[PDB]
Assembly symmetry: D2
Homo-oligomer: 415 residues x 4
């Protein structure tokens, strides 16, 4: 009768550096990276927990967390303990130990047992905080209880050649995990469906009592790298009962999303592509859906504005997504995504451009196939996208020709 | 030393019907009308109160106030009494008398003395809630105390020809009010500056104890129409000391506003004009200003989206202001202001259009010189602005050719 | 898999006058009456909705609603539409019609169909807002869908002699409702257990569109008094499928409540008793429970204080419940319940006293067996509970000797 | 005309360890210590800022700050940047530098200039976060601008023998500071009033642009201990213009406070004394004042309860201050102060006790002259205050005989 989410706590792992995002994560952890016009990556897992009815949330942070923690303080501020709600931001710090850094994803939870236990949740839902996806976690909770698993593991069903970069679960007829392989060159297929493999999402459901004991087990073992994927879960698949949960069974698709949507935006190319795809006529991700909404930190913002329309300049956007507090003054935008606060000035042009909040585009600048970091001021007349060798020397250039542009790159600029 | 706003309470008169806005105010009071892709009209006086440091606000409502009350409840919800802050919504209702109607603007304060006296504010700032303007009321409060006035009245300095439509204050050299005239055919000129007259704003500062006594006198006087403008102030200019405060002295102008901005948007033409002027290259009102911000009710909204770009259709906006959650799909917008939630569809065209929230524009519709009421669905292929005779039969058409369009008029439609 | 409350809207009927509470409800509807030391009666149903997972709430108000509506505005302010939550305060007002009065409890929902249908909830949970009880509405929802009922009705299982004051449901062996009788002299018994009758709590679960259809037909029938209990529900038991849900199956009992707790505090004796019973060593209602908490409007308040300990005066409380911001200065309290803000002064005595917020007790006053209304100032030396004849002349005195004391009564006082 | 607080930012130094409070500050910094029944010490400076109209606040933390940060996050959560309000929590950490420690109170501001400069406040109000006092900083701001000072320093006026423990300002006839001495053996007296000296409160007003340069200068000086009182202020007194502001000129006294109140609660005795003094008939600090309120983090909490009244046990409090959610079950309290959540059980007695939140007193325990730390569980039958030598072996006992009791101390216990 009662939904199990009433008795669950979501615990989000948000310490991931995202080192392949290069300068995009030099000053902020990957869960803090802006995505899709407004939110940050972490808001997706957070919103999944909220919309699934989980109203105790803990977030473990580590690497470069000041921007992430400030976002969480200001955006996720509406939980009240009187209502059996809680939002705990849990950085590694001189608190219960000297340390100041978590030893691994397991240690991220283990060090905060004294926070969890007063709440006495029946269940723990462990979440990667660095992916973009919508999912109703009540489904996994139900499967976990009914299957008697020690751990239920969220898995994507992917073509085996795509699984070579994931931690892959090897399952039997009834989706019980026989073995776990980190990045198999030839991923094991699903029995009776070997064109596909189950790739771990880093979503784990436990009974709290079991998890605490296993965290304590783990923390005593010197063999352990203190990691869910490499230590906790492999021990259980061997000695206990681990079961896979398939993302397709619990993904929340809107009427305007043709397939289950999950993205890890792990490379500059992948991050550019996921954002720019939102400019499509029929985008894979429906950012206009209100049935499974993404909460985030947002301020009252004025509308977007388009000015100038003469023989020489026209401020206008085609095949583009433009946020509030954007003033497109005499600037031509095509196939671009603009976050809030952008100022694009006369005779400039943006094409195939992902523009993070509060960027300024100087008069006459022309930028194609770029990601412009938050707050960058683009000098008047800067050309990007016309000279690959010049662009690669000045900026971080992808082999597929995307330039990531940061303020530090701009400050160094000559010819 | 201490600012006088700490000891003031703002009391906003928000019962105004705005009869000349015709069907724009059929189901909402004038202070509830949307303005500027920014806020509702009432939010300007409320934000002026807030930014001036007044932490006690009351709002008297009357004519058709459901939409207005719900906006106040949801938008103006962050005052806490334990911080000596209060926000009181005061509709005429069976709480102290049967009535269910306020007899006038003086009565709207008078019936609520039992709300005011427990707060014991030293000063009352009585405000009209149906005008768009920015003003720092600390200045009026200083002038009032130092002048020793019984009432201090905010006044616009305007050419006398334009003053024929206002309550007009006749003053001596000291800016003390020696007479008041309701709509003078020949407005009294300011001494030494005869080309201008002081036109009342309906902004009044009193010592609370004095006002409470003047309201009690007024509730007894059978010759009184129970109106601040026509009863309270004239009695004081007669028997006490009334002093005029000029708008230009305390108007808050941003660096991008060439002159003090005040608008009463009292007619459809004036409402259309003030909104459409926000699409100018250098607008009179700076809605991007952050130094004197306008607080309002706002939700997390997705960005605006423009799609399609081929031989036959292109979704794009030129010389226009576009709010979030607008999808401009194959539609051409020019010199238009769109509030949130608009959906404009393929081959439609808007020009010189003020489009309130959640309007839908059907394919192939072409509309020029229009105000479209909140939530209207414009039928595919509807043409407005081509045939004044037909437009005037179907719609509320001003002499200058603005068509106000409501869903009730759409529902009646044929050829 | 997904809880049904996600898809439900709770709709609280809060127009009740509670006329048998006499002067306690002369300026406030019954759901606004204070109960238990802090909350108001309406907060119980509201908190049940919230704790059950229902995040769309409507509250219909009518009789003397200013205090109620201010309570809802300031207390129930944390719902956000972006999260698919809503809290709508729905007074009878000149809005969709002139009226200024709901024709009945069915009409209170019918008039507001235009507010419900934009939310399109799958289920409606219609609640009476004038009872004190705790209940998980997910159980009723499941029974309602699983049974295929047209309406599921919440029912107290009570001894038949106690059911003569209730509207009683006659059921068959499957708890299907075969008849409904308003206040039967000899209430029909439950089959196979005739010592008990099922007494209607005025809680009704419907499929939304079935209810919209029953509401519309009811508004059309001139036979109808426009009432859930005597119009909607009788027709369904006759023409459709009405099923009873027993309170015991879904009451939320803390470990410290020996039985399911339900109270209608319909009379001054019952209100006094239910409150004073909280001073017991083992109270029937556990106001210290945090597993099913009651949300309300609460301000930051200083602690309670006890002053003076000498020959002739000692401020102290025995067998009593004392809220914050109470200063017990030389006053003896025994078996009393004090809401916040009380000032009891030297040489006064309270026994068997229910004391609503911000009451003042003057020096030397002695009061026994009383309910003291919000904000009453008790004159120095007043004696209540000594002389029944004099007490009944001065105050509202019950047959059993409880005096309800209002400020209007105090104002009239001599000897 | 315009108050100066509109353009100030308050910056609270809250990294103080409070070493002399011993185990009371072993797991929290001094600003996080509970005081007076509800608030925490830091809430006084924060409330002074808020009530003075300062809407931008920064709080620098360092030593053991988890509890403090969580308090700030949950309690001080109502500032919105759109209203030009801001509340920044600034712990030393990896962000702008590796360090993760502040080199001193000046470096606590210096490391965060990049947070300050975007706001561009005209004035900085630097505050000590570890003192209990009320003060209207608009007075100090007015004095600063009008005097032309480089730094205006808040100062207590105390008898000279008392000043020997303070940093003392030597002034001339016009309250200009001519020397500064750290703990003078013989404190320089006030000219014309040699019985008194000016003791620095560690409150400093600057022009922001001045301060930013003085900090940059300080961050270059290798002879600098990076301290406001030790390096910044003496430098200015020497080469610039430092002016003293006397606390009596801007202290906020309620009508029930016989003198300006300031306490630093630096020792266990001083902490115990300031709290127990609140049980007085006429307390020096008025915690019931509403004119200058102290905001803090508070939850909805049930009332206090007193039970049992027979010949062997009576739950009651005399000359005591008792917070909500305290159940006094057969326990006798006298001259004690209880924070929320205490459970005192049958036959126990508390005298002269300061009892922090959520303490449980076991049956038959008898405790006199104690501070009991947050959450301590006192064993049944424990006796404290009877045997000085035993009490000092078990607990932290002051020379004056106050025992500080923590759970670690209880956990060691036998006889």
């Amino acid at each position: 009768v009662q939904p199990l989410a009433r008795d669950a706590m979501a615990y989000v792992l948000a310490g991931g550096r995202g080192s392949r995002l290069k300068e995009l994560t030099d000053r902020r952890a990957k869960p803090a990276v802006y995505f899709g016009g407004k939110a940050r990556i972490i808001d997706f897992a957070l919103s999944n927990a909220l919309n699934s009815g989980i109203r105790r949330i803990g977030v473990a942070t580590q690497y470069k967390a000041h921007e992430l923690i400030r976002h969480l303080q200001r955006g996720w501020d509406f939980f009240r303990p009187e209502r059996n709600e809680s939002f705990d931001i849990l950085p590694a710090s001189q608190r219960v130990s000297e340390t100041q850094w978590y030893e691994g994803t397991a240690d991220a939870v283990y060090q905060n047992i004294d926070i969890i236990e007063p709440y006495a949740p029946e269940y723990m839902v462990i979440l990667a905080g660095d992916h973009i996806y919508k999912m109703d976690y009540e489904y996994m909770l139900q499967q976990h209880v009914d299957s008697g698993a020690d751990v239920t593991i969220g898995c994507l069903e992917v073509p085996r050649m795509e699984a070579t970069g994931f931690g892959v679960m090897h399952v039997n007829e009834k989706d019980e995990i026989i073995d776990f392989i980190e990045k198999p060159a030839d991923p094991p297929g699903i029995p009776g469906n070997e064109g596909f493999a189950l790739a771990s999402m880093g979503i784990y459901v436990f009974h709290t009592k079991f998890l605490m004991e296993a965290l304590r087990r783990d923390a005593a073992d010197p063999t352990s790298s203190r990691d869910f994927g490499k230590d906790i879960i492999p021990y259980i698949v061997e000695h206990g009962k681990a079961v896979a949960h398939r993302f397709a069974d619990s993904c929340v698709r809107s009427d305007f999303e043709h397939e289950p949507y999950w993205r890890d935006v792990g490379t500059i190319d992948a991050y550019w592509q996921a954002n720019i795809d939102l400019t499509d006529v029929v985008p894979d991700l429906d950012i206009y859906d209100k049935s499974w909404p993404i909460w985030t930190y947002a301020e009252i913002t004025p509308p977007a504005k388009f000015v100038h329309d003469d023989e020489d300049r026209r401020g206008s956007a085609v095949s583009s997504v433009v946020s509030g507090d954007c003033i497109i003054s005499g600037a031509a935008l095509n196939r671009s995504l603009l976050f809030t606060g952008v100022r694009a000035n006369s005779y400039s042009r943006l094409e195939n451009a992902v523009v993070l909040p509060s960027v300024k585009i100087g008069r006459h600048a022309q930028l194609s196939n770029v990601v412009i970091d938050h707050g960058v001021v683009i000098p008047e007349g800067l050309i990007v996208g016309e000279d690959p060798e010049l662009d690669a020397k000045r900026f971080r250039r992808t082999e597929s020709g995307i330039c990531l542009i940061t303020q530090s790159m701009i400050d160094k600029l000559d010819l």
